[PDB]
């Protein structure tokens, strides 16, 4: 019987920080969320004092293939900035042009 | 500071300025109304207190 026992004796959740001297496109987008109440006459929001967050990201939505008709934007309609899409909407510009005028005569 | 902007940049800057003026007018109008209701509310409490 041989035994070696005797012989053994002897971060994932952190968002990107916006860069200082941030692009003008980002600032114009952040202003739109801050003043989103005035974009549409028919849409109203809860009162919120929204301050620019210390960390944030700009993202693009991705729809499921089943939402090809219901909730998809055409490629031409898509724009790099939230502002640029808003200008494209013809109904929005008509309301802004009309509403912008009335403030001017009153002023 | 003096700067030189292209056509597309000018359109974006004009669009923002239009929005802020509309937002400023809408915000003030809501303020004045709720301020008035405070005045009407106060004039009624004076009856309640008296």
């Amino acid at each position: 019987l041989e035994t070696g026992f005797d012989a053994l004796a002897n971060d994932w959740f952190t968002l990107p920080k916006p860069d200082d001297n941030m692009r003008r496109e980002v600032q114009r987008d952040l202003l739109l969320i801050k003043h989103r109440a005035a974009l549409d006459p028919k849409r109203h929001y809860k009162k919120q004092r929204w301050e620019v967050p210390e960390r944030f990201a700009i993202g693009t939505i991705i729809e499921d293939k089943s939402e090809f008709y219901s909730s998809r934007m055409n490629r031409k309609e898509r724009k790099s900035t939230i502002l640029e899409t808003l200008m494209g909407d013809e109904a929005s510009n008509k309301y802004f042009k009309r509403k912008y005028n009335e403030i001017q005569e009153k002023s | 500071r003096a700067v030189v902007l292209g056509g597309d940049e000018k359109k974006a800057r004009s669009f923002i300025q239009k929005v802020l003026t509309i937002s400023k007018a809408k915000d003030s109008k809501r303020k004045e109304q709720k301020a008035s209701q405070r005045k009407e509310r106060l004039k009624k409490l004076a009856k309640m207190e008296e």
């Binding site: 600032q27 | 500071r1 003096a2 700067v3 030189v4 902007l5 000018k10 800057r13 300025q17």
Partner: peptide, 11 residues
Amino acid sequence: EDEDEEEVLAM
């Protein structure tokens, strides 16, 4: 910052 900047040499 748009208020800070002013546009010149326009066409």
